[PDB]
Write a protein that binds this DNA or RNA. Structure first.
Ligand code: K
Ligand code: K
Ligand code: K
Length: 149
RNA sequence: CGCUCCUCAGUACGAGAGGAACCGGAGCG
């Protein structure tokens, strides 16, 4: 499919704060999460890595929080995250950068860190069940939000 | 001792969405 993500970017090809409308191919996003390692950010970029989605390692939900209205089960099922993330029983949401040109992220180069952009593909652990494509509202930082489609 | 860079380490430690230090290396005061 294809997800529409809205984001405010300071179009360096201008400088000003512009309201871009990015379109992502669900197919390509999934491809991304597959070519991506199945670990909890112990890579140079730090991706992919756990997306708490408002939760804690227990499955209990953090104060003043509200999970992403994902839809499909699993994705909305309180996670279970244990330290290395590699809990022989754990199950949680991972996040990885995804881009409109749906190229695979250089997950291992810190210094210099390939800019991860505003969007990420969220998929289950350890089955990589695509959940959705969320993105920051302003720039490539801040609070994540589930885009439309 | 102070500052820049590497490294430590995307580690430790986090979960307001991130993220140190000590040791060590290069340099300036
Ligand atoms: K971690
Ligand atoms: K340092
Ligand atoms: K040092």
């Amino acid at each position: 499919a294809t997800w529409t993500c809205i984001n405010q970017q300071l179009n360096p090809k201008t400088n000003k704060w512009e309201d871009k409308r990015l379109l992502y191919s669900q197919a390509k996003a999934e491809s991304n999460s597959h070519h991506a390692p199945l670990s909890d950010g112990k890579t140079g970029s730090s991706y992919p890595h756990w997306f708490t989605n408002g939760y804690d390692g227990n499955g209990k939900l953090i104060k003043g929080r509200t999970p992403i209205k994902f839809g499909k089960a699993d994705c909305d099922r309180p996670p279970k995250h244990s330290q290395n993330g590699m809990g022989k029983d754990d199950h949680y949401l991972l996040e990885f950068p995804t881009f409109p040109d749906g190229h695979d992220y250089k997950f291992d180069s810190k210094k210099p860190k390939e800019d991860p952009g505003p969007a990420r593909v969220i998929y289950t652990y350890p089955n990589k069940v695509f959940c959705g494509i969320v993105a920051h509202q302003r720039g490539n930082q801040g609070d994540l939000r589930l885009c439309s489609h």
